[model samples]
Target chain A: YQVLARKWRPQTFADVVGQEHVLTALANGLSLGRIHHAYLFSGTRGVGKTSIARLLAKGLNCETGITATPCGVCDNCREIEQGRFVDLIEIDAASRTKVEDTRDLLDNVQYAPARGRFKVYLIDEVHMLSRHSFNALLKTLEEPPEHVKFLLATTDPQKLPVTILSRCLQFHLKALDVEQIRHQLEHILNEEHIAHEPRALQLLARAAEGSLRDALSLTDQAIASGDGQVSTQAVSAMLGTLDDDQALSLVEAMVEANGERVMALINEAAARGIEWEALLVEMLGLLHRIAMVQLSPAALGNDMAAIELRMRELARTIPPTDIQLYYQTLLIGRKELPYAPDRRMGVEMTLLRALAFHPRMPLPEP
Target chain B: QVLARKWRPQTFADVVGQEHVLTALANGLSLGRIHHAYLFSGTRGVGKTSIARLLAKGLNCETGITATPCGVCDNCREIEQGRFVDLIEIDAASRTKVEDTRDLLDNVQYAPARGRFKVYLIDEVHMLSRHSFNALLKTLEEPPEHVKFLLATTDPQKLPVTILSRCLQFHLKALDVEQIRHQLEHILNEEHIAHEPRALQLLARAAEGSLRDALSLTDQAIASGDGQVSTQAVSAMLGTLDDDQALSLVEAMVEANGERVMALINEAAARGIEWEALLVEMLGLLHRIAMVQLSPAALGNDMAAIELRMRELARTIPPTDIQLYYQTLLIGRKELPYAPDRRMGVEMTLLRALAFHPRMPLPEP
Candidate 1:
């Protein structure tokens, strides 16, 4: 079976969520006879950017005449949905960034649409174009064939030249919050007839952060990987979310100033080929919750999956200031982690640094 | 003309920083330890192409191979103006196929029409295609005695290992704040443009180790006035002026001046600039303050008058509090996007920094 992320892709505007700001503007623009020659969608992946661009194309081409809603039964809309429409051109700019490739692509910009009202050009990751190619593309993006619409998309829109940015009507899409992702995942699982815990979907949603596609794909993978049902433990094991008890134990040992025990525990983790970076992150995230309880007990209490109890209990387990210190040191560690002689060594040294800096019990004579 | 193009370094002494690279190039010239292929790799605007041009000029100088080229030489003048037939600066980003590579290969064998060496400076060399790189390999593995190649790239990672193995590589680092500022001042002084040291500092900081970017910003800053770079002008032109409130906010936070900090933020909301931007600017400054606490040597590159003030705050502030505030601001920035409004985000960030700050007692909750 196909991945749920793709199989459930929104074919219409109403099917997408969390980007009402964008949809409203586009819908109003299309229905009110106000269409811009160029549009830029800038945001991180799976924020429904490509989906919106496709919707724009469908709305422009649907036989009902450039309206806000496309009739799915119409020949143009169906062809566009199937990715076979001659009028809807899709190019991944990361690959074909040479001037020649862009020149050839633009060479046909003057031609009339074979089967639609306007020829749509969707260039994804357009920031990868080399400077010369950027110059060539800018020449066309400034003014081009009357029938052409440029729908440029990129995650790093800041990399684009100000000149290119000035020409297009830009939209910065917001990431979907975890609540939306959880609700959607719950809805999708119900439609798929798979048993799920609301808490387990929360894990996937938080794990996905703002990307709904990631949440959906993880849901599909979790079903296959985790006992064929979405449970807290199952999703945790699948997504490596809700990491293990060892992270907590190591933090406790460090807070206790048991350097040898901390190293001993870390050594065992190293033997398991555990990703030290991910382990460090897990510890850092846990420390955040623990620190929250030290100060704001009610904040942690909102995590209704009984997490606040676990965190509150865990808070009673370490040297008080050490958790906050650990959070700071870990943040610094991840920032400088990439330069480590090796990532494992980086984490080990970060762990080792915690010993020297512990206020209550400093490990002197390093 | 922009100072970046106008003050093009003509000799080894003119080149700012990169002592290691220059020393190597100068030694290779004086000792005649010439290599047929040289690769310069670094991010953009950090003098990759400029260094390549210098090398090309040194190779083709009529006076023979020397670190100090005779700029008056007909050959050197032609190379400087890019009119020299032998000193070809090919942009490889646009030509990645065998047709272009093989065409250049045919030209590689010909002796210099008017100079000592036929210089081929292939800029952005990483853009070569799979097949083109092989053609270049075959073409370069055997070359005429008069031919030398200079390849420069902002991304050396994209180039193949085999291509790297063929050439002696020198990775150029980005210029630090002091290095770029020193260069900018020298240029402006010689060009006789009036400037404020703090204004120059703003341009230098925003340049982010790119001398070319600094000079470009300088061009705009100078153009906006009567050949003077004022601190206010630099901020207004680059939107880094809004950074002033953040600095003030930091100062207040440091001296336990909560009233001033709150007043400045309210001033921000009234002025109608982006609160998120304000928060980010504050977070970035505090992050640097923490860095100064850890390593002041790199902090000088911040190129801000506020750096001096923040560094002053660093001594009074304990190392632990600095670290504490650094992490809080980071977490706060992440939280800002999800806030009810931009103002809410900024308030939370400012308040969070205050709450975690131990010297300032917890408010009467």
Candidate 2:
């Protein structure tokens, strides 16, 4: 059973919504009829570094012409499109990054392409190769055969030998921006006949965190659990994340030393079936931001500026040490989440401890 | 089937908030202090009319004037339904004439139609025109033995001292989020609607101390959730602001650009949010900035346009200056209505902050 994330793999360069930085350069290189022999594509997973390597192979091998827009009618491009092209040798360098593996892999690199004009060697996670394996690959990169093209991808590009990196035209595939991911999801759901609530889509888009695959997969999971209805409740339950104001109110509760209110908030969280560990993480993140605002008010964002205004007063009102103890306690709570009999109970106690520690100095100004 | 109307309390026990008002009414009802004219004053949607009706039910219930009305009695049913002839519910807001008051005064001399007492429940009593208040004065102060005057209004200040002095006034308190949330919990449980506690909390906070507002939000939340109340459903229905505009002010404030701050205030005032709410928004922002300063990670959804400016202000704006601005703004909001215009009121507030800053800890350019 193929997940929606994997099944909807794009076949052409234009299908990729993000990575215009790399795509624009590739578009010019292929159309101008001047292509780099060795290219290094780098970024985190699902950001399209490996996918771009295959697209480059299609551009180089398409029988119609060397073009950014590959002609699907061409037999060579079609084979490469389906990941079945012989000339496009896709290797999992992560699994085969050994001297013996590299020796057998590049044994016939100097030979001309058997079918297409270019033999594209797509090596994914190229940083996984040993030092000796890199030396072998570096030697090949130094004096590449006329028909051979190297398309390498790695998460940790620094691990690749300098000699090998220097020889390749590097194109760093950055993570998708929130707006870009949102832009695509809006179009994706429209095409897929998926009826989604505004807030349901909002959670998935935010949770995706710049990964289209992550977002779509969550939508699929959300759809299934919702029994074909993509409602906010189903999706929110699926993500178990906080409302933007949820933690802000909790922070307010903490500042007031309202023990009952703090407990009430946690009880509310428990009722929502929130992932306690994730909540602590959110709390920690919140505390970190507030600390930054306290230290450097400029760190606050435009949307947060108002809240920063809210927080600025509390910043001075609350003793700095109390904030640290809360942050530190939440971290301890995160650790206790896995071991305790009740993670919710554990979270409650950690919060109580922080409350216990705060020598609340300011008389709450009416 | 409207939640607000359906959940309307039939007895004092049913009214969830405004304990003090209920206690006073209960004491008066039990002891037979039986004041002729009673004033019910509070902010709108805070259960003023509801309490007035409950008081009416207590006075006219067929079960005999008791704190806990026998809701099954014909008199209680009629009063609750707003159909009891003796329990006159006058909406003074619409019928604002001296003749209307004179007409009511003519009727007030008569005996009870169905119950122990004749109850005149006037809602939004403050809207009765000046001449109407003058005309109704004698009867309001000294109604017949069977007549009881129940007055309700959001604004008590507008009523004449002559009217106020005659009545035993019970000012209902605006309900808090937690208090309202408890009310929702009780009503939803009775209705058998499953709800996320978080959802109720959101509506409670969003309600901003009006049980009517809270229940109304519940109506929207239930409709959107298809029966059960969900947190996300409630949040989606109620829109919230992010930190952007707050940052614009902070950016200007840290730079001590009084001109830009006023410009921002002018634009915000242009939206026509009650100047008090707008002032509270500023106070809320200042509080968040201070919290951010106290502990950075507290306001999640960290990436924002104001991030640079907020961070800059945290460093540039001194703790003492923020304190000064916060206190000045708080006091200014209290005095906001006195200034004639919100724009000028807010302008004056900013001027006060700017006035105090030069002597404070903010570093000079």
Candidate 3:
């Protein structure tokens, strides 16, 4: 079975979600015939670096001329999509990091393209290349042939030598926002006709931590784990994320500094086999939304009316920076949860810390 | 062969940094007061299994059950190469059930094939099933004269007190940073691998008291550094601070030099050093300072040059401020995943640490 991420991988710029800024720049570059010979795309993993590089390659070699949107049915587009194109050389620099391998690859840089307008060299994880390997490629990168284009992508751009970086046009791909990821998942689920709760998509979106590919792959797993049906409970169970009003109740208790209520709520959560990490994640998400409502009331729409109402109430009750402190507490608390002797105690201590540091109780008693 | 295994200590004298346990065991062996059942317990990579093997060699060597096993003896060589028939090493984690335990103990009555004693070495003995423990208890309580038991575990609590009472337990201690560093440097020098002392220091800290982990990390550092272990290469390999950045960060915080703090953070951010890891480094530094402040004598070691600096910071910064910043950043670390991004998370966390002073009133909302 094909994974949704690979199957639904964007074939055209229009199909791509988010990255409009990059798309606009690339589109303009193609139309204006002002493309840089070497382009560096940097971002965290699975943020569409490779996908966009492929899209740009298609744009450059499409039979319909150098246009932003390539005709998918064309031979050049199909070949590139199939990764069987003669001129498009994709190198996973990690596996082939030897200087000897790099030198041989660079030897072909001076040769003309066999079938396309340009010889697009797409190097992924380019930072893993040896210093000598980078040196071998640097001369070509500095001044490549008119018909040659180099596309490099790495999660860790800091490792790249400044010399190589200076020779390329660098563009950092932004990690997709949670909402962007949610909407994209929603769109894909609908297209796939896979029945899913809207809340399930939100949970997946947040759990994905800003990678659309991760979101989709998670959706694929959620589909299978849920017996082909995605629901809020199943996704929550799978993600170990809080799904019910317990998160809201916990937040409410936290805002009021009601230790008794918080403890009781934590007990109930523990009874449900909810993971400590997920509990923190859920609380953080709620706290983030509350902060959002406080800062920009208009950000959340009527679609989440019930959530909106509660978040609005909490936002008003807690001072803005107080929310920041509480949010900050739970966040750092989450990191310590794993190291804590008892996860339950970790959750309790973290909550206690937030309560102790509450603005209302400024200097906690010695 | 991997450096960890290739450099395994063949005799008791070769082992380092585990003197307390070794001293006791050596005394027992030399005095001919050997216990039939010996339990070696400690955290991972701290020489538990290796020490168990050394004991097994001592028990079975042709030189008799001596503390100093002659390395050239056939019996010692066989034990070192793990071909000694008299020495049976059981991974209790894998064979935890009563059936495996029964089958294993069935041979306790058998005579030694070549050596003086039939030695049983059970690693991770805590993982044995309750029934397995019960079955093993029988042989342990009334073991044959020619038999010896050496059990090793990271956690001895899981073993029944019944089993615990029967054995003379030696709790192996985790190696300290200085010891791990000394060993890494020793290995790198012996292997003729070009290395920096600072690089070995990073590997040692990153290893976190596990000589095995330190060795493996050194192996990776060698490849990642393209054959030499340099400070920069090891830092990139582990994504941690190589220089005195962590110390300087704490120093900056103490000096109230927020600008210097941010500049250091920005430089780290530019280098793709993970904010979470950097925060951990800071937390670790704070911990060292707190320790120095609490009890330098209790620490029982003369201050390393870095510890000397930590001592200075502890003296300069109020104990309360150090505690406050540690608590602040300790919680701040959890916020990274929830923050908009790591850089902002780090900035806000450090800024909060800088802004908050223990003597000051909590900042207004």
Candidate 4:
């Protein structure tokens, strides 16, 4: 019943996906015996800041030697992997932001390592520490015992004081782009032998928004939701990736300022069991493509000719500001959905507002 | 120095605008018809809290409950410095819990430590929880003889009617562009900052009735414009257009010249004009032209050059065309985020408006 995110977490340097730059630098430091007492890894959530920090700890304290490639069978390596290594203390600083905790944690820094070569401290979300807590940390960070190695991880390095930043070696992990995440998902799905459509994997990768852990977590959900077979139809329904043309039709109706046609489209979209927010998101996306084509017709590349033709028609028919007005109205209208009596009514009102608020041109005299 | 804080009204006389509010407050203070609890409601950066503070000074002044407090008096000086023991100013936004209200009311029973009255000035009072309001109501309904409650809020609608009925409510109005502009010019002269008159005008209108916003923008304008404020520097910083540039786009569109419209867009884009502001500027010009077309009197003598241009366009373009152009661009500004970029959106909106002239047929799909 274990989720793929945790079950497939990289245990060795070679097992890690992407982040080759950080891996190479740390590997070189370990091999040359030029290890720094402190290291800072900064990146967005689930981009492997904490994961890379743990790998470095294993490199420092593994029983075989202070080398990048630790023998997985050794007691030190296995204990570290299992999160039972006595000397490797991990603290989530967000929960322990008080100065007293910082003082208590720093007091034991001077002590000798009990079970490993170095007492490695992994502080996650280190930016959440209080001002006094940071001040208390600065003294020890500047001068620490030879047995101590501090590893700090944060999503926001800007919050950290320059004094603390200057005392450490910094590594910034880049977000995994869609291609990297998609390829990794395919590799994992094949290894697990889970039946999945390529489109379903692509959908999951895009939904992850650059987090590999998030991608795996969503894939686990897709499998369960699809009942063991991750088909495109099932995945689309599960993610509420409402059909593209339906959204385009809604935009076309809006351009005409046809309230009756809009109501008809909404009814059709409702019959398909699409969420109001999802429909709005698709409409916004379609509008984005239309605006792109309106700006530069040459920019449309590799898109379906049928959709591109419709987009060109919109670019020509509706004035740019009208599209801007509808886009802005719907963008704001999406937030108003939850507060409405019901989602359907909320969407209808938002669509109606887009029409009613705009002052249309008077019809020419007969 | 921070201009917003440095130039903040120290006394009622120094306040830049809202004479009606000042007059009423002054009259009430002089007549000694002081309400135990007074509610000051208005949009942000107006003198809501400032008036409340002045009222507090009138109540606690050593000379008596006078409309004008002697600034040199110890009571007045301490209140101004925000160190007075009796003047208990609380931020209701943070202290919103029933427990926080309970802890607060426990001290309400105590007499004033130094001043004549124990003034409870609560800012953003609407943020208090329902239960917290209930906790405060009993004391508010019939307060201590030595106590006075002054509440300030940007949103008074959020406050319960029961609370509203108990206190004297005063709704403050936002400042006008003319008032804001004069204040900006006055501040620049005192600061000895060399600035163009048009730069101050841009800052005035951009503030949208908030004086603090205007002042802060002026501060940034000075820094970015390198110690002097010019029309070019201000427009560049704000990503807005010069009046003539925006006017020319309207002139081209009204003439139904598509080529000229595209050329003007390219020029504006090259000048690094933000499409949103440019469209807004054109929309404003269309609005003025519509006004002039309806009644010449509405188009003021001020801005003579622009007014003359508007008067000419007002005569040439049909009222229906002006309405159509306004409506199209009004909606067009909204489409910007969806466009490849703002400049493209502006171009398309302009082209669409030009193509849809009443005399012309709709462009073939």
lDDT of 3 by residue, B297-321 (tens): 3222322547667777767766546
Any runs in candidate 3 off by more than 4 Å, and if so which? A28-35, A62-67, A96-100, A112-117, A156-159, A255-264, A267-278, A288-303, A306-325, A328-345, A355-366, B1-365
Taking the candidates in order, what DockQ does each have? 0.01, 0.01, 0.02, 0.01
**Residue A97 lDDT, candidate 1, scale 0-100:** 39
Give the per-residue lDDT digits (tens) of candidate 1, residues B1-365.
Answer: 77767777888778776655676677677767666677788888888888888887888887899988998998888887878889877787663444575476666767788888888888888775434455566555556688888999887645533355456666676664556777788888888887787678678877877887888889888788657877778878866533567778877766667677778888877777766556556655655554454445535533555667877866666655554554566566667678998687777777767766666746465
lDDT of 4 by residue, A34-131 (tens): 88888999988768777778788888988889888878888888667654567877665654222246657777889889888999988777788767
Task: List lDDT for all candidates, in order.
Answer: 0.71, 0.69, 0.74, 0.73
lDDT leader: 3
Ignoring the other chain, what TM-score does chain B have in each prediction? 0.82, 0.67, 0.77, 0.82
Error of 2 at A144 (Å): 1.4
CAPRI-style grade of the A/B interface in model 2: incorrect
* Rank order (by TM-score, best first): 1, 3, 4, 2
As for candidate 3, its clashing pairs are A331-B334, A331-B335, A332-B334, A332-B335
Task: Give the Å error, residue B38, model 4.
Answer: 1.6
Q: Across residues B1-365, which tens digit of lDDT does each residue of candidate 2 receive?
A: 86987988888997765554565578668767576677788788788888888888888877777898998988888888888888877787663454565477677788887888888888877766433455455564345788888888877645533355456566565554456777888889989988876578667878877888788889988888678887668866864332255557656765668878888877765554455655665664565455455445434332343566565565566554555565577678767778987668878877777767765335476
At residue A151, give the lDDT of candidate 3: 92
Clashing pairs in 4: A320-B349, A321-B331, A321-B332, A322-B332, A323-B335, A324-B334, A324-B335, A324-B336, A325-B334, A325-B335
Give the alpha carbon lDDT tens digit for every residue of A1-366 in model 1. Answer: 234655676778888887888999999998997888889999987576666888899999888998888888998986666555678776656653343465566777888998898999877778986666567678887778788888998899999879889999999988998888898899988987888777678778887769876677567556544534777655654433334356667777777767667767766764433445667887887788788777766655233435445566767776567677888887888875653423544565566557657767754321
Compare candidates 3 and 4 on TM-score and give the better one: 3
Tens-place lDDT digits, model 4, residues B1-365: 86777876667887766554565567667766666677788898778887888888988999998878888899998998888899888776663454465467678978998888999888988765333455566576457889888999987645533355456566566665657888898988998988877788788877877887888888888778777877777876676665588888899888888788899888777777767777767766776565554336556434465777788887877665666787677668767677997788888799888888866535465
